[PDB]
Each structure stands twice: as C-alpha cells, then as structure tokens.
Design an enzyme around this catalytic site. Structure first.
Site, PDB file in Angstrom:
ATOM      1  N   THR A 154       2.444 -16.804 -43.243  1.00 54.79           N
ATOM      2  CA  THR A 154       3.574 -16.274 -42.510  1.00 54.79           C
ATOM      3  C   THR A 154       4.037 -14.941 -43.116  1.00 54.79           C
ATOM      4  O   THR A 154       4.402 -14.889 -44.296  1.00 54.79           O
ATOM      5  CB  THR A 154       4.690 -17.326 -42.395  1.00 54.79           C
ATOM      6  OG1 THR A 154       5.769 -16.710 -41.706  1.00 54.79           O
ATOM      7  CG2 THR A 154       5.170 -17.854 -43.755  1.00 54.79           C
ATOM      8  N   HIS A 210       4.083 -31.796 -52.107  1.00 51.60           N
ATOM      9  CA  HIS A 210       3.865 -32.512 -53.365  1.00 51.60           C
ATOM     10  C   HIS A 210       3.055 -33.817 -53.200  1.00 51.60           C
ATOM     11  O   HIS A 210       2.535 -34.328 -54.186  1.00 51.60           O
ATOM     12  CB  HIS A 210       5.180 -32.768 -54.126  1.00 51.60           C
ATOM     13  CG  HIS A 210       4.994 -32.749 -55.616  1.00 51.60           C
ATOM     14  ND1 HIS A 210       5.871 -32.067 -56.444  1.00 51.60           N
ATOM     15  CD2 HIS A 210       4.014 -33.298 -56.373  1.00 51.60           C
ATOM     16  CE1 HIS A 210       5.394 -32.220 -57.672  1.00 51.60           C
ATOM     17  NE2 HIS A 210       4.283 -32.963 -57.677  1.00 51.60           N
TER      18      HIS A 210
HETATM   19  C1  LIG Z   1       1.480 -10.840 -35.794  1.00 54.84           C
HETATM   20  C2  LIG Z   1       1.954 -10.234 -37.125  1.00 54.84           C
HETATM   21  C3  LIG Z   1       1.881 -11.297 -38.232  1.00 54.84           C
HETATM   22  C4  LIG Z   1       1.092  -9.019 -37.481  1.00 54.84           C
HETATM   23  O1  LIG Z   1       1.535  -8.454 -38.728  1.00 54.84           O
HETATM   24  P1  LIG Z   1       0.740  -7.196 -39.286  1.00 54.84           P
HETATM   25  O2  LIG Z   1      -0.727  -7.410 -39.382  1.00 54.84           O
HETATM   26  O3  LIG Z   1       1.318  -6.869 -40.655  1.00 54.84           O
HETATM   27  O4  LIG Z   1       1.001  -5.976 -38.294  1.00 54.84           O
HETATM   28  P2  LIG Z   1       2.214  -5.038 -37.860  1.00 54.84           P
HETATM   29  O5  LIG Z   1       1.784  -4.207 -36.698  1.00 54.84           O
HETATM   30  O6  LIG Z   1       3.419  -5.884 -37.486  1.00 54.84           O
HETATM   31  O7  LIG Z   1       2.628  -4.092 -39.106  1.00 54.84           O
HETATM   32  C5  LIG Z   1       3.315  -2.836 -38.910  1.00 54.84           C
HETATM   33  C6  LIG Z   1       3.307  -2.061 -40.205  1.00 54.84           C
HETATM   34  O8  LIG Z   1       4.084  -2.762 -41.204  1.00 54.84           O
HETATM   35  C7  LIG Z   1       3.304  -2.967 -42.366  1.00 54.84           C
HETATM   36  N1  LIG Z   1       3.692  -4.247 -42.953  1.00 54.84           N
HETATM   37  C8  LIG Z   1       3.664  -5.470 -42.336  1.00 54.84           C
HETATM   38  N2  LIG Z   1       3.991  -6.472 -43.117  1.00 54.84           N
HETATM   39  C9  LIG Z   1       4.269  -5.862 -44.333  1.00 54.84           C
HETATM   40  C10 LIG Z   1       4.714  -6.371 -45.569  1.00 54.84           C
HETATM   41  N3  LIG Z   1       4.804  -7.678 -45.846  1.00 54.84           N
HETATM   42  N4  LIG Z   1       5.009  -5.481 -46.543  1.00 54.84           N
HETATM   43  C11 LIG Z   1       4.824  -4.179 -46.302  1.00 54.84           C
HETATM   44  N5  LIG Z   1       4.368  -3.588 -45.196  1.00 54.84           N
HETATM   45  C12 LIG Z   1       4.111  -4.489 -44.240  1.00 54.84           C
HETATM   46  C13 LIG Z   1       1.845  -2.917 -41.902  1.00 54.84           C
HETATM   47  O9  LIG Z   1       0.926  -2.609 -42.946  1.00 54.84           O
HETATM   48  C14 LIG Z   1       1.928  -1.827 -40.834  1.00 54.84           C
HETATM   49  O10 LIG Z   1       2.020  -0.547 -41.493  1.00 54.84           O
HETATM   50  P3  LIG Z   1       1.497   0.858 -40.907  1.00 54.84           P
HETATM   51  O11 LIG Z   1       1.993   0.938 -39.432  1.00 54.84           O
HETATM   52  O12 LIG Z   1       1.955   1.951 -41.760  1.00 54.84           O
HETATM   53  O13 LIG Z   1      -0.032   0.739 -40.814  1.00 54.84           O
HETATM   54  C15 LIG Z   1       3.417  -9.727 -37.008  1.00 54.84           C
HETATM   55  O14 LIG Z   1       3.643  -8.839 -35.932  1.00 54.84           O
HETATM   56  C16 LIG Z   1       4.485 -10.812 -36.987  1.00 54.84           C
HETATM   57  O15 LIG Z   1       4.671 -11.478 -35.971  1.00 54.84           O
HETATM   58  N6  LIG Z   1       5.221 -10.952 -38.096  1.00 54.84           N
HETATM   59  C17 LIG Z   1       6.310 -11.912 -38.201  1.00 54.84           C
HETATM   60  C18 LIG Z   1       5.829 -13.277 -38.651  1.00 54.84           C
HETATM   61  C19 LIG Z   1       6.944 -14.295 -38.611  1.00 54.84           C
HETATM   62  O16 LIG Z   1       7.777 -14.294 -37.706  1.00 54.84           O
HETATM   63  N7  LIG Z   1       6.986 -15.166 -39.613  1.00 54.84           N
HETATM   64  C20 LIG Z   1       8.059 -16.145 -39.748  1.00 54.84           C
HETATM   65  C21 LIG Z   1       8.838 -15.984 -41.039  1.00 54.84           C
HETATM   66  S1  LIG Z   1       9.686 -14.381 -40.970  1.00 54.84           S
HETATM   67  N1  LIG Z   2       4.370 -38.479 -61.846  1.00 58.36           N
HETATM   68  C1  LIG Z   2       5.189 -38.340 -60.815  1.00 58.36           C
HETATM   69  O1  LIG Z   2       5.219 -39.139 -59.871  1.00 58.36           O
HETATM   70  C2  LIG Z   2       6.104 -37.139 -60.851  1.00 58.36           C
HETATM   71  C3  LIG Z   2       6.759 -36.840 -59.506  1.00 58.36           C
HETATM   72  C4  LIG Z   2       7.912 -35.858 -59.611  1.00 58.36           C
HETATM   73  C5  LIG Z   2       7.536 -34.534 -60.264  1.00 58.36           C
HETATM   74  C6  LIG Z   2       8.675 -33.560 -60.539  1.00 58.36           C
HETATM   75  S1  LIG Z   2      10.107 -34.314 -61.378  1.00 58.36           S
HETATM   76  C7  LIG Z   2       8.246 -32.316 -61.319  1.00 58.36           C
HETATM   77  C8  LIG Z   2       7.486 -31.294 -60.485  1.00 58.36           C
HETATM   78  S2  LIG Z   2       8.419 -30.679 -59.053  1.00 58.36           S
HETATM   79  N1  LIG Z   3       6.078 -22.847 -33.126  1.00 60.08           N
HETATM   80  C1  LIG Z   3       6.551 -23.748 -33.973  1.00 60.08           C
HETATM   81  O1  LIG Z   3       7.038 -24.823 -33.604  1.00 60.08           O
HETATM   82  C2  LIG Z   3       6.460 -23.393 -35.438  1.00 60.08           C
HETATM   83  C3  LIG Z   3       7.319 -24.286 -36.328  1.00 60.08           C
HETATM   84  C4  LIG Z   3       6.983 -24.154 -37.803  1.00 60.08           C
HETATM   85  C5  LIG Z   3       7.071 -22.727 -38.330  1.00 60.08           C
HETATM   86  C6  LIG Z   3       6.603 -22.497 -39.762  1.00 60.08           C
HETATM   87  S1  LIG Z   3       4.975 -23.227 -40.134  1.00 60.08           S
HETATM   88  C7  LIG Z   3       6.589 -21.025 -40.175  1.00 60.08           C
HETATM   89  C8  LIG Z   3       7.969 -20.450 -40.465  1.00 60.08           C
HETATM   90  S2  LIG Z   3       8.863 -21.323 -41.783  1.00 60.08           S
END
Ligand SMILES: CC(C)(COP(=O)(O)OP(=O)(O)OC[C@H]1O[C@@H](n2cnc3c(N)ncnc32)[C@H](O)[C@@H]1OP(=O)(O)O)[C@@H](O)C(=O)NCCC(=O)NCCS
Ligand SMILES: NC(=O)CCCC[C@@H](S)CCS
Ligand SMILES: NC(=O)CCCC[C@@H](S)CCS
Ligand SMILES: CC(C)(COP(=O)(O)OP(=O)(O)OC[C@H]1O[C@@H](n2cnc3c(N)ncnc32)[C@H](O)[C@@H]1OP(=O)(O)O)[C@@H](O)C(=O)NCCC(=O)NCCS
Ligand SMILES: CC(C)(COP(=O)(O)OP(=O)(O)OC[C@H]1O[C@@H](n2cnc3c(N)ncnc32)[C@H](O)[C@@H]1OP(=O)(O)O)[C@@H](O)C(=O)NCCC(=O)NCCS
Ligand SMILES: NC(=O)CCCC[C@@H](S)CCS
Lengths: 240, 240, 240
Positions: A154, A210
C-alpha cells in the site's frame, strides 16, 4: 453537499467497512517499522526515467522497485507468503506470489492483484500496476482481479504520510506500506568517522499477523528488502 | 501505598476500561503519521504570548493553533467529520464540529467537548480549553459536556511522547494526537540546493476508522492541516 | 522446502496464534513512542565491556541497562505493574516485578520470566537473560519459567527494527520494545544556542492496556525510564 446529510454508502465503502472490522478480530495484527536509504534507487530512477518511458510506454515510479524487492523477499521468506487455518492449525506456504496493490479511486479504496508476480520483470510490474489502477478507476475489473492475493503493498506516501499501521485482510499474513520518500540528514560511519549526509529516506511499516509471523521473522524479512533496495543493483532489471 | 494491594477502581477508570475495549471491537482503527514544521507557529506564539495573556486572560499554548487548523479541515473534509451506522449502512456527515479534548486529571482521563467549535476564534478556543480542563479537574462538568463529540484532539506531547496510536470512540471516526514539538535537523530544498536547518518539528498521528475513512482520505485531510500550520497565517486570528 | 506445502504447525506457533488473537480482544492496546539518547550508556558499555566479561562471565549488551531502568520505573509507577479484573472491576498492584523477556528461538517466540527482578543487580540481570535464552533455545525451561510475568521487554532492535506495536498478553498491562540504537543527527540546546550533534538514539515503543494505564500515565512512566537512561549513572551498578 455532504455536510448535514445522512446517505446510504456505496457498495465499495460498505464492503471495506465490513471487511476491515472483521479482519482485526480474526488475526493478531501489529506493525514493525524499518527505515531504508532510497538514495541509490532515486538516482537510478532519475537517470533512466526518459529511456524507460520511451521503451516501455509507462512512467517509472518508485513502486516497481518496492514490488521487485518485496516479491523476491517473499520467495526467500516463504513463512511470510503464507496463510494460517485457525481451525486445523495448518499453515499453507504459497508457491505463487500474488501481489495485491492498494489503489485509491474516487468511489473508494480497491485492492486488485498482480497474479504470479514472481515471474515478472520491473517493466512488466510497472505496466501491470498502470493496467490495474486504470481498470480499478474505470470499472473494468473482473472478480478474479480482486481475489487470491498472498501479500499487499500500500503506497501510503502517495498522500504525504511518513507511516501508518495498515490493516491486513486474512487469509493474507502481511501488508507493507511505502511511506513518503523524504530527504533527511542521517549519520554515515566509515573508517571510524561519524558524519552527517543528506539522503532520501523512507519508512516501511509492515503490518503482520502474529498467528503466522513472529517479530524476529518480520525483522529478517524487512532486512532482506532493505539490503536489496540500499544496494540498488537494478540497472539490468530495467531492460533498457 | 498501592503496591501489594487489590482495590476497586473509581468510576472514571471503570468506564474508560469498558469503553476502550469495546471501541476497538466495533471499529477498524489504524494510525497514519505525518510530520509538520511548527517553527512559524512557535515564533508567532513566542512573539504574541505577552499581548495574548494581557488581552484574553489565558496563556497561549500550541493547542488552539492545532484546534483551529483541525476544525477548518473537518469543515473542508466533511467525510472525516462523520459517523457510520453499520446496521443501516448510512453515513451521517455532521454539520457541527463538536471537538473533544482529552484532559488528564488525577482521577483519570476525561474527554470534554467544545460544541460548535467551527464558530470559534483562537481566543475563544483558548478560553474554552481552560474552562473544560478546570471543570474536568474540579468535578464541575455537566453530562452534555461529555457527549456529542464528532472528532477528538489528544495532546500526547504533554508528557513527552513523540507519537501514539490513540483509541477513537465510536460514533467518532477520528482522533488526532499532537506529539511533542521538538527541534530537529531537517532538509530544506530551494533553488536546487539541499541544506540542513534546525526546525521545530511535530509528529501528528491520526487514528481513523477504516469504516468511514480510507488511507488516502486520511492523507488528504492531514495534508490540509499540515499546509495550514506550516504557512502559519494566524496573526489576524489572534485578535490582538 | 516449505514453499508449495500445507503443514500442521508446532505447539509454540499454535499457542502464539491463539494467545495473540485472544489478547487483543480482552484488552485495549495502544502504543506510545518516546526517543531516548543512549550515547552515555553506549560509552559506558564500550569502556566496561572487557572488565564485565572477565568478572561476570557474560557479554555486556544494552538489554540489562533497559531492564534495570524499567524495573525501577515499575516500582516507582505501581499503577503500571498492575492487572485489571474486568469482572470485579478491581486492580491488583503487584509487589513483585516479574519481568518477561521475549526470546527468539528457531521453533518460535518464547517469553520466559525473570521473577523478582526488583531484587537484581545489572550483573544478575545479564546472567538471568543468558540463562533464560539458553534454556528457551535448548528445551530446558520448566512451566513456572513461562508464567507470572507482570511486564515484558521485547528487543525488536535485534533484527533491525526502529519500532513496532508489540502485543501485550493479559494479565500484563504493558510491553516495552527496545528499538535499534542508531547514530542520528539531533539538536542540542545550551545557553540559548541550538546546534547539531551525532548521538546514539533509540525509539522505545510502549504498548499499554488502556483498561489499566491512560496516555499521560504511560508518558510519565516512559519519562522516568528516559531520564534514568540519559543520565546513565550506572558505573556502581556494574559491580566491577
Ligand atoms: C495506483 C498507485 C499505487 C500508483 O502509485 P505510483 O506508482 O507511485 O504512481 P503515481 O502516478 O501516483 O506517482 C506520482 C509521482 O509521485 C511519486 N511518488 C509516489 N509515491 C511516492 C512515495 N511514497 N514517496 C515519494 N514519491 C512518491 C512517483 O514516483 C511519481 O513521481 P514523478 O511524477 O516525479 O515521476 C497510486 O496512484 C495510489 O492509488 N496510491 C494510493 C494507495 C492507497 O490509497 N493506499 C491506502 C493507504 S494511503
Ligand atoms: N510465546 C508466545 O505465545 C508469545 C506471544 C506474545 C508475544 C509478545 S508478548 C511479544 C511480541 S509482540
Ligand atoms: N477494498 C477493500 O475492501 C480494502 C479493505 C482493506 C484495505 C487495506 S488491505 C489497505 C489499507 S489499510
Ligand atoms: C535473548 C535476547 C533478547 C538477547 O538480546 P541481547 O541481550 O541484546 O543479546 P545479543 O547477543 O542478541 O546481542 C548481540 C549484539 O547486538 C547488540 N544489540 C542487541 N540489541 C540491540 C539494539 N536494540 N540496538 C543496538 N544494538 C543491539 C548487543 O549490544 C550485542 O552487541 P555486541 O556483540 O557488540 O556486544 C535476543 O537474542 C533475542 O532473542 N532478541 C529477539 C527478541 C524478539 O524476538 N522479540 C520479538 C519482537 S522482534
Ligand atoms: C488540558 C490540556 C490538553 C491543555 O494542554 P495545553 O493547552 O498544551 O496547556 P499546558 O498548560 O498543559 O501546557 C504547558 C506548556 O507546555 C507546552 N506544551 C504542551 N503541549 C506541548 C507539545 N505537544 N509540544 C510542546 N510543547 C507543548 C505549552 O505550549 C505550554 O508552554 P509554556 O508554559 O512555555 O507556554 C493538558 O493539560 C492535558 O491534559 N494534556 C494531556 C492530554 C492527555 O492526557 N491525552 C491522552 C494521551 S497522553
Ligand atoms: N474518559 C474516557 O473514557 C476516555 C476513553 C477514550 C480515550 C481516548 S478518545 C483518548 C486517549 S487514546
């Protein structure tokens, strides 16, 4: 427009709400954080970006480098590319690395999957991410594009975050966040001399279950990823 | 005195224990972290502190600046100032911003509420925090002072913490922690030159409910807060 | 070998999977993070390491310093060395500090206990950690070596992690992680002058149960540990 109203949520939001609340109750989630020096990858990316777009037709972002390192680490750490069945007490170690990619869309978060990612080169990964993000945003996914994932990446750094505690969704055992890559002053130690350098640093929070992975296993897995990215031997991987 | 004894807990502790365990089971909590350069706010605060106490009668801390930026962000991001009903699948987008403030008291943590915080200026916010903290510590709250909150701010930096993963309490969808503001060496980039500066930096961990807010929504909301605080155009807001 | 197979897990893995999933459902876990300047401890450790191995027979690592500071803090903060009974609403404040130590073994994570750690000197702590880790790794523990713990310390820095959100196991109310100790550029302020120094810094994430400990209590407890480690008056404690 929304302010002061009560509205039925769309299906993506309803599913996300249901899946994320349940996921936390059937797993033991915790998030381990490591820091990685991305300077060499940033320099390699800047130098080869024009040749990459010209040959492969897509922009070269940091995400295919994170994907390549993570997929290789999941092959060498099979204990992480695994699922636990709490009823039978059996662990399934997957042979395929089906990599889920979180994609931000206007209707909500979607997690499409790159199936058999272990067989892909960096250009193929870059193209698959573009295809999945485009089809996610334009309602052109098929049901099998959203299932079978064995691990997720992500990009939390897309909207400025340094870190997060992302939620994994069972049967997956891990989800890695790629924080914002930021220039920071860091300490370099060489020949007994400590000094301060400006480097492109990233935080990589890994949420792991875990039930499947212990803290030391998560650290060994993240160390493999960190060493691959810091060495940055990816020139040949770019196929230019 | 306590050591080696078993004692019935007071009512505040009993309620906190019950509410926090339950809260995690009926929400999907995760914590996203951003870093903010508070130098301009720190300089503005230092320069205007004497005139603020003289005119408004209360000390000028960092908390009213965080509250002002957060309340404006909750108005421009109504999707965050919202509550999800898991039974009907309906999202309620609140028109009022009722801001809960965590207050440390000797009998335990209390979370009184600043109702309709969107209508308040920085001096009014500073006075409301002082009034709520004083009444919380002296048993002078009324039941409606502890209910109706739509978002919470918790000052985790009060006791030295850089960060935390604060627990939100449904029906709220978010709780922001204000970490300790600490001088750090950071990289500044201007006209192609990278250099190292000493700046007052803070970590802002936001715990959000994934039923209501996705990771990219949390990032966009935190980016709005960060840009408001970093620009620090609050001179007129001080009403001096 | 594991890749492409489904296998019944060993007993340690099965117990860990069961205990960690359950633990999160019967507690209100959150993780507060503080940073500590370990330079003085690192210098003291480097200077006295040869004399320590010669007299006490064991290597001097950072862990006995963290254990000594944590155990003294648990005596002066009895509210943290405590257990909550959710059925009777009673808090038990333990008189003994029975310190659990997470030990990474090839068959899985084990958490043996140093009983009555408050009565031990740094050399006795160093020897007890070595004995527990050795017996954990060679199947030479007794059942009472794995029960009665009142608090846990987990060395997450062993495999490179800066931080984690470790899982506590009730009846314990807290678990402290010792992140990787890394040289970092930090700001020093003396006589009105801000300047940049290279110091050995560590992140100490504390997971605490909100049923027992509030955020300000966790901060006060971590501040006691931080001040003890930063002053580093441990010369006499080494018994050389
Ligand atoms: C599909 C996706 C993953 C593609 O990401 P991507 O491959 O990095 O592509 P993007 O077009 O969005 O990136 C645009 C620019 O930002 C930069 N960038 C992206 N992520 C970056 C990061 N973590 N750190 C620094 N720069 C970053 C890229 O290198 C690119 O730079 P440039 O235009 O100078 O070449 C993205 O659009 C997306 O949806 N991100 C959000 C994911 C999300 O919602 N996660 C949930 C938790 S927030
Ligand atoms: N032997 C075990 O069952 C340990 C489980 C819990 C681990 C914690 S207290 C430490 C790592 S998050
Ligand atoms: N489309 C979804 O239901 C995604 C739900 C879980 C998202 C996680 S794996 C990434 C952001 S914490
Ligand atoms: C039993 C155990 C706790 C002992 O740890 P220990 O007292 O630090 O001893 P070790 O022999 O492993 O340490 C080896 C070296 O690393 C150093 N080191 C260990 N932890 C460190 C840290 N957090 N930061 C920096 N250096 C560290 C030690 O000082 C020692 O250095 P030296 O050889 O130069 O003297 C450890 O072996 C272990 O099992 N750690 C993993 C715990 C775990 O799995 N936790 C779960 C969450 S990851
Ligand atoms: C009611 C309350 C929120 C008021 O906080 P406040 O507005 O910052 O006011 P305080 O009087 O406590 O602040 C004292 C000083 O510390 C400073 N300070 C407070 N928080 C700070 C932070 N995060 N970083 C740096 N400085 C801070 C203030 O600016 C003020 O400085 P000054 O005396 O030089 O003017 C506070 O007393 C409180 O209860 N905090 C704890 C909240 C809590 O328990 N949260 C739970 C998770 S820990
Ligand atoms: N008085 C209470 O019961 C508060 C419980 C919840 C506290 C949270 S919102 C803030 C600290 S994590």
């Amino acid at each position: 427009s929304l302010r002061g109203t009560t509205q039925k949520v769309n299906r993506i939001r309803e599913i996300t709400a249901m899946k994320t609340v349940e996921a936390l109750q059937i797993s033991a989630q915790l998030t381990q954080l490591h820091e990685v020096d991305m300077t060499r990858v940033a320099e390699l990316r800047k130098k080869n970006k024009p040749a990459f777009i010209e040959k492969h037709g897509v922009n070269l972002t940091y995400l295919p480098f994170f994907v390549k390192a993570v997929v290789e680490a999941l092959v060498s750490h099979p204990n992480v590319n695994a699922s636990f069945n709490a009823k039978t007490k059996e662990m399934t170690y997957h042979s395929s690395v089906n990599l889920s990619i979180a994609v931000d869309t206007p209707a909500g978060l979607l997690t499409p999957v790159i199936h058999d990612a272990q067989d892909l080169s960096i250009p193929e990964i870059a193209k698959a991410i573009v295809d999945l993000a485009d089809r996610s945003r334009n309602n052109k996914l098929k049901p099998n594009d959203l299932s079978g994932g064995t691990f997720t990446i992500t990009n939390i750094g897309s909207e400025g975050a340094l870190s997060d505690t992302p939620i994994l969704v069972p049967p997956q055992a891990g989800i890695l966040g790629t924080g914002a890559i930021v220039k920071r002053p860091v300490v370099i130690t060489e020949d007994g001399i400590d000094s301060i350098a400006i480097r492109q640093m990233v935080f990589l929070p890994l949420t792991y279950d875990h039930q499947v992975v212990d803290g030391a296993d998560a650290g060994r897995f993240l160390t493999t990823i960190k060493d691959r990215l810091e060495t940055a031997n990816f020139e040949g991987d770019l196929q230019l």
